[PDB]
Amino acid sequence: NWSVEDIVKGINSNNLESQLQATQAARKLLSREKQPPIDNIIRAGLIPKFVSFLGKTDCSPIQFESAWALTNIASGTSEQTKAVVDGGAIPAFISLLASPHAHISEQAVWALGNIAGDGSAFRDLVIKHGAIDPLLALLAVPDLSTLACGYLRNLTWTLSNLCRNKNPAPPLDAVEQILPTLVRLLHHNDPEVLADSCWAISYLTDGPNERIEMVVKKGVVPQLVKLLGATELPIVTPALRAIGNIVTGTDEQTQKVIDAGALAVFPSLLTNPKTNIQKEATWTMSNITAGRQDQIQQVVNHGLVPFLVGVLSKADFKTQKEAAWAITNYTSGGTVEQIVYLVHCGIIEPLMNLLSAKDTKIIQVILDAISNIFQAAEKLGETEKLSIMIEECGGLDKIEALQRHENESVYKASLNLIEKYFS
């Protein structure tokens, strides 16, 4: 393991071979686990030299070594990635994509992935330099299965970074050019390719309805639903996120998710041991119950109300919070019959128990569900019958103490509930 000083010497020699030996030595240093001396290599002014070696077509070994060395530097902080880009590395790396040498092309893929992964500005700059055509050409084979596994995973991951951040989101024509290939990857058998593919789709669906639409039009929902029930957490997580983003769109878009059979997967998702899965499953449910009355009926038919009642009863506070939203949306847009069914499932007790929460936000969401529920009772003149259940559980108190509160909306609704159904 050479010293940075010696590496500088080798690179400064006008000896191609000496430069090769010094670059490899640089690569090995930047490969350590114990904090690679990235900042020193940068201050030493080596980046421009490395970028220069990327263009030495007659010495592929130094193309590889320097590509690798640059990749690890680009894998650092934004300041470090910026250094690589500032060195002119982008067009040099795109030129390597078409190298007859797979290991070199692969490093270029990897390098661009880290550059694009720094943020939207670098992501777009990489796109402006025309990285998309070359990248897509690499996956231009009839059956993905004939590609080396490790190589396919790298490309997938890099394409994923080209889909990622939101300020701004990737260029629309870039997304369109990418989608077809991305969809082939979403249908591939490698568990890692499947995971990153799902992350890419989850990014493309994090935005305006128009964004969700171009992904939905590619018929990916059914595959997403299938992945939604995979046995690997790494696949489930991004699939559920993508599903979650899609149900934030139009009711027509949400219906594609329900038609694909997504709801049958929620019994296990809403009881998943993984706190995060449970929380995003409930979130997804709250945007489904915010749909039409016929979609709320689908929630009911799949027997998901008891599951919502359960999560609201016992779960991480953040999961319970989404549950409240789900119930408030359900109570807000559902029929009288659907709301009655909700009460027969036992929503009152656990909903009351949450009024003690120390989070003003969940108290407003719940008092809202209570208003909604009473409003339904009113059409059944069974108001008084509910007004007792809420006393029973011991809610008449919490709504009572919620009069003498602090946040207006709260004691405004609290009080409004008292004088009208109780006192």
């Binding site: 490969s31 686990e33 894998s75 990897w110 992935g113 720094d118």
Partner: peptide
């Protein structure tokens, strides 16, 4: 987000 590589060596 970002990932570095490390092995080989000749």
């Amino acid at each position: 987000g970002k990932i570095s590589k490390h092995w080989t060596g000749i």
